[PDB]
Amino acid sequence: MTFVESMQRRAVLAQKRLVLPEACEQRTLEAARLIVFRNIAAKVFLVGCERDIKNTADRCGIDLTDMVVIDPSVSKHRDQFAERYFQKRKHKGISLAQAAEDMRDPLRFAAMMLDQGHADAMVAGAENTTARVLRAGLTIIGTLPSVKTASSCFVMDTNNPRLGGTRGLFIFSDCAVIPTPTAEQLADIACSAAESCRTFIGEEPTVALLSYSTKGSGGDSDENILRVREAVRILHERRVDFTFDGELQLDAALVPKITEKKAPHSPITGKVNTLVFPDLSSGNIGYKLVQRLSDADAYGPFLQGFAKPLSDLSRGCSVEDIVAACAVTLVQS
Amino acid sequence: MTFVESMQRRAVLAQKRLVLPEACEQRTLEAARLIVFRNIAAKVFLVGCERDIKNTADRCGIDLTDMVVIDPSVSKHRDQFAERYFQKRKHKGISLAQAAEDMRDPLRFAAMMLDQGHADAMVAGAENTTARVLRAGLTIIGTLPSVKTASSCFVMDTNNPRLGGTRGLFIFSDCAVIPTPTAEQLADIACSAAESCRTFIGEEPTVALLSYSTKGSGGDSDENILRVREAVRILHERRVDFTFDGELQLDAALVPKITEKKAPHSPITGKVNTLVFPDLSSGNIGYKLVQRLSDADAYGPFLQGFAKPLSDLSRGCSVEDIVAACAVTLVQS
């Protein structure tokens, strides 16, 4: 199958709970109906003002009978959610009443459903800004204990077995979120990209931390080189369970003859399927170069490192983009 | 007609003067022979100790007949070159006699031939470090008046006229030399890359200065975004004669449907053939991704911005590689 087909079938198998806070938006509700029709989720929670949602559904001819509308103003969890948000945020000086008002927002309320164990996967961003989506994620859901940084990746399908990797499948990370990762964040990015490789490609991760330098060739003074080198040291210190090396140029990562000249006895030779970029320009430009100048497909961006999975959509997304993002996030949980 | 054959043919038509300071190296003399045999240059100057050069030739069985040995020890330009070097370098405290000894070095002498008008193109690096070759370039030859920075590009051939560019050809720059260009340096790289587009691809240059941000989308705080935006302002101030725009994501540069959304009314829409990367990691990773994960070929790195063309070879280059480098550098004059 294709990647999208495989992710949808795996979501059907996983039978997890989806929450959608942009439930007054037509595309979101159409996606929710397709999710129900395809059995992509065990439960579909629509979060928002009940009569605004029902009104949108009425006008778009959408049956909600297998969906659960949760209204943050009326929910039985309202008081507990306001209290949990206050405890989370009181260190920034907000009041309990400000917390209660903030938790009437569908985006915050859906994120708190994940934090509190009432749903498994959240998708938003067809109508909210990326900044708002990531902020709800960072401040309500938080990160896994193994990282301090939330990041993102793309799944790159070169549609060419022979191009190395895992039958031409790669994880590229972080090509969308963190502008200039510190050495510690870069190590976090590598750890989360390793998890993404296991979830999305289904093979063991072999990770190359990339640079214009290979194992010293660029010198010892450029902070950008040292940042990547320090990340590699940090990964050794952390005793991670995946194979990794850096700093490596792309050709040293992917062409064994070159690895043998520039990085001898490197443990990644001939096996790399996960590329960690040194900064956001290199990764954002890089994945687009592969997408737009070759027959490769790029899937994502997929968020990683969050304690519970969420996705941020483009504001111009299609219904099927929403469905695809929901399936991937459900498979991540 | 391939790219290497196109350049070889064009050098034959151009009938320029080549200087080779590594004339005691066997591959260089074998290349020199092919260059004479193929009429790729009007004149082939071998620079060095005539006896060491003749000795190498005899040991290897190489005929030198239509080549001209120019011996820095006895050349009629001996005293003028020493004075010129002294004037260039006296601000570092050297004496005239030291300048004269310095100008017995074949590499320095070849570069001075370019500066003084006695040859058109220099190739070295088969047995000199890149740093040595570049330093000779910068201290002796200098840069064109339109820039203060020498840099490099690659000619990328996607082998697919629909991918954009000029029949599938692109200039990528600077993917090999400057680790973190200042805004002034990025503007210089754009100017030099536009020159290389004209020389190597043969079409009008349309230059995209790349970033993870498109026309403000990544905000106004990240210094790497501002460096690119500043370089664009600088190009406007210089009133350059090529079309440019930035900061642009790669898809906004290359995909007009996306340009119309993220960069409406951009001057580059649908015409970009020259990509300027914001730093060396993004460019070095970027060109290699295209080379290694697609059908594209990568030719270079080609130096650019020097007042007279020179080329740095790889230490392990083939004889045919040397010939191809000479032809490109001659086409560059």
Coordinates of N, CA and C in Angstrom, one line a residue, chain A residues 158 163 170 172 179-180 210-213 222 224 248-252 254-255 258 262 275 277-282 284-296, chain B residues 158 163 170 172 179-180 210-213 222 224 248-252 254-255 257-258 262 275 277-282 284-295:
Chain A
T158 N 11.0 8.2 -1.2 CA 11.6 8.4 -2.5 C 11.0 7.6 -3.7
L163 N 17.5 3.8 -3.4 CA 18.1 5.0 -2.8 C 18.4 4.8 -1.3
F170 N 12.6 7.6 4.5 CA 13.4 8.3 5.5 C 12.5 9.1 6.4
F172 N 13.0 12.8 8.0 CA 13.7 14.1 8.0 C 13.2 14.9 9.2
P179 N 13.9 26.7 15.3 CA 14.8 27.4 14.3 C 16.3 27.0 14.4
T180 N 16.8 27.1 15.6 CA 18.2 26.7 15.9 C 18.3 25.9 17.1
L210 N 23.5 15.7 10.7 CA 24.1 16.2 9.5 C 24.8 17.6 9.7
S211 N 25.7 17.9 8.8 CA 26.5 19.2 8.8 C 27.1 19.3 7.5
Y212 N 27.8 20.5 7.2 CA 28.7 20.6 6.1 C 30.0 20.0 6.5
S213 N 30.2 19.6 7.7 CA 31.5 19.0 8.2 C 31.3 17.5 8.4
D222 N 33.7 26.6 14.4 CA 32.3 27.0 14.0 C 31.4 26.4 15.0
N224 N 28.2 26.1 14.8 CA 27.3 25.2 14.2 C 27.8 23.8 14.1
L248 N 28.1 14.5 10.2 CA 28.3 13.9 8.9 C 27.7 14.8 7.8
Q249 N 28.4 14.9 6.7 CA 27.9 15.4 5.5 C 26.9 14.4 4.9
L250 N 26.0 14.9 4.1 CA 24.9 14.0 3.6 C 25.5 12.9 2.8
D251 N 26.5 13.1 2.0 CA 27.1 12.0 1.2 C 27.8 11.0 2.1
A252 N 28.5 11.5 3.1 CA 29.1 10.6 4.1 C 28.0 9.8 4.8
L254 N 25.1 8.7 3.4 CA 24.3 7.9 2.6 C 25.1 7.1 1.6
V255 N 26.4 7.3 1.4 CA 27.1 6.6 0.4 C 28.3 5.9 1.0
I258 N 32.0 6.7 0.5 CA 32.4 7.9 1.0 C 32.5 7.9 2.5
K262 N 35.7 9.2 4.7 CA 35.6 10.4 5.6 C 35.2 10.1 7.0
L275 N 17.5 11.3 9.2 CA 18.3 12.5 9.0 C 18.0 13.6 10.0
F277 N 18.7 17.4 10.9 CA 19.3 18.5 10.3 C 19.8 19.5 11.5
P278 N 20.8 20.3 11.1 CA 21.4 21.1 12.2 C 20.6 22.4 12.5
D279 N 19.7 22.8 11.7 CA 18.9 24.0 11.9 C 17.7 24.0 11.0
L280 N 16.8 24.9 11.2 CA 15.5 24.8 10.5 C 15.6 25.2 9.0
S281 N 16.5 26.2 8.7 CA 16.7 26.5 7.2 C 17.2 25.3 6.5
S282 N 18.2 24.6 7.0 CA 18.7 23.4 6.3 C 17.7 22.3 6.2
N284 N 14.2 22.7 6.4 CA 13.0 23.1 5.7 C 13.3 23.2 4.2
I285 N 14.5 23.8 3.8 CA 14.9 23.8 2.4 C 15.2 22.4 1.9
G286 N 15.9 21.6 2.8 CA 16.3 20.2 2.3 C 15.1 19.3 1.9
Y287 N 14.1 19.2 2.8 CA 13.0 18.3 2.5 C 12.2 18.8 1.3
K288 N 12.1 20.1 1.1 CA 11.4 20.6 0.0 C 12.2 20.4 -1.3
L289 N 13.5 20.5 -1.2 CA 14.4 20.2 -2.4 C 14.1 18.7 -2.9
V290 N 14.0 17.8 -1.9 CA 13.8 16.4 -2.3 C 12.4 16.2 -2.8
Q291 N 11.4 16.9 -2.2 CA 10.0 16.8 -2.7 C 9.8 17.4 -4.1
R292 N 10.4 18.6 -4.3 CA 10.0 19.3 -5.5 C 11.0 19.1 -6.7
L293 N 12.2 18.6 -6.5 CA 13.1 18.2 -7.6 C 13.3 16.7 -7.8
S294 N 12.4 15.9 -7.3 CA 12.4 14.5 -7.5 C 11.0 13.9 -7.5
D295 N 11.0 12.6 -7.7 CA 9.7 11.9 -7.6 C 9.3 11.5 -6.2
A296 N 10.0 12.0 -5.2 CA 9.7 11.7 -3.8 C 8.5 12.4 -3.4
Chain B
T158 N 19.0 18.6 -13.3 CA 18.0 17.6 -12.9 C 17.6 16.6 -14.0
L163 N 10.9 20.4 -14.4 CA 11.2 20.7 -13.0 C 11.5 22.2 -12.8
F170 N 20.1 24.4 -12.8 CA 20.0 25.4 -11.7 C 21.5 25.7 -11.2
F172 N 23.2 26.4 -7.7 CA 23.1 26.3 -6.2 C 24.4 27.0 -5.7
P179 N 31.1 29.6 5.5 CA 30.2 29.0 6.5 C 28.9 29.7 6.9
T180 N 29.0 31.0 7.3 CA 27.9 31.8 7.6 C 28.0 33.2 7.0
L210 N 17.0 32.0 -0.2 CA 16.2 31.0 0.5 C 16.2 31.1 2.0
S211 N 15.2 30.5 2.7 CA 15.0 30.5 4.1 C 13.9 29.5 4.5
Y212 N 13.8 29.2 5.8 CA 12.6 28.5 6.2 C 11.4 29.5 6.3
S213 N 11.6 30.8 6.1 CA 10.6 31.8 6.2 C 10.3 32.3 4.8
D222 N 14.4 36.1 14.4 CA 15.5 35.1 14.2 C 16.5 35.8 13.3
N224 N 19.0 34.7 11.6 CA 19.1 34.1 10.3 C 18.1 34.5 9.3
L248 N 12.7 33.6 0.8 CA 11.7 32.7 0.3 C 12.0 31.2 0.7
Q249 N 10.9 30.5 1.1 CA 11.0 29.0 1.2 C 11.2 28.5 -0.2
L250 N 11.7 27.2 -0.3 CA 12.1 26.6 -1.5 C 10.8 26.4 -2.4
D251 N 9.7 25.9 -1.8 CA 8.5 25.7 -2.6 C 8.0 27.1 -3.1
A252 N 8.0 28.1 -2.3 CA 7.6 29.4 -2.8 C 8.5 29.9 -3.9
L254 N 10.0 27.9 -6.2 CA 9.9 27.0 -7.4 C 8.5 26.7 -7.8
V255 N 7.5 26.9 -7.0 CA 6.2 26.4 -7.3 C 5.2 27.6 -7.4
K257 N 2.0 28.2 -7.9 CA 0.8 28.2 -7.1 C 1.1 28.6 -5.7
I258 N 2.2 28.2 -5.1 CA 2.6 28.5 -3.7 C 3.1 29.9 -3.7
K262 N 2.0 32.7 -0.8 CA 2.9 33.1 0.3 C 3.7 34.4 -0.1
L275 N 19.6 29.5 -6.9 CA 19.2 29.4 -5.5 C 20.3 29.8 -4.6
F277 N 21.6 29.9 -0.8 CA 21.3 29.3 0.5 C 21.8 30.2 1.6
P278 N 21.2 30.2 2.8 CA 21.5 31.2 3.8 C 22.7 30.9 4.6
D279 N 23.3 29.6 4.5 CA 24.5 29.3 5.2 C 25.0 28.0 4.5
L280 N 26.2 27.5 5.0 CA 26.9 26.4 4.3 C 26.3 25.1 4.6
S281 N 25.7 24.9 5.8 CA 25.1 23.6 6.1 C 23.9 23.4 5.2
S282 N 23.1 24.5 5.0 CA 21.9 24.3 4.2 C 22.3 24.1 2.7
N284 N 25.4 22.9 1.5 CA 26.2 21.7 1.4 C 25.2 20.5 1.5
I285 N 24.3 20.5 2.5 CA 23.4 19.4 2.6 C 22.4 19.4 1.4
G286 N 22.0 20.6 1.0 CA 21.0 20.7 0.0 C 21.4 20.2 -1.4
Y287 N 22.5 20.6 -1.9 CA 22.9 20.1 -3.2 C 23.2 18.6 -3.2
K288 N 23.8 18.1 -2.1 CA 24.0 16.7 -2.0 C 22.7 15.9 -1.9
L289 N 21.7 16.4 -1.2 CA 20.4 15.7 -1.2 C 19.9 15.6 -2.6
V290 N 20.0 16.7 -3.4 CA 19.5 16.6 -4.8 C 20.3 15.6 -5.6
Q291 N 21.6 15.7 -5.5 CA 22.5 14.8 -6.2 C 22.3 13.3 -5.8
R292 N 22.2 13.0 -4.5 CA 22.2 11.6 -4.1 C 20.8 11.0 -4.1
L293 N 19.7 11.8 -4.0 CA 18.4 11.2 -3.9 C 17.5 11.4 -5.1
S294 N 18.1 11.8 -6.2 CA 17.4 12.0 -7.5 C 18.3 11.7 -8.6
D295 N 17.8 11.9 -9.8 CA 18.5 11.7 -11.1 C 19.5 12.8 -11.4

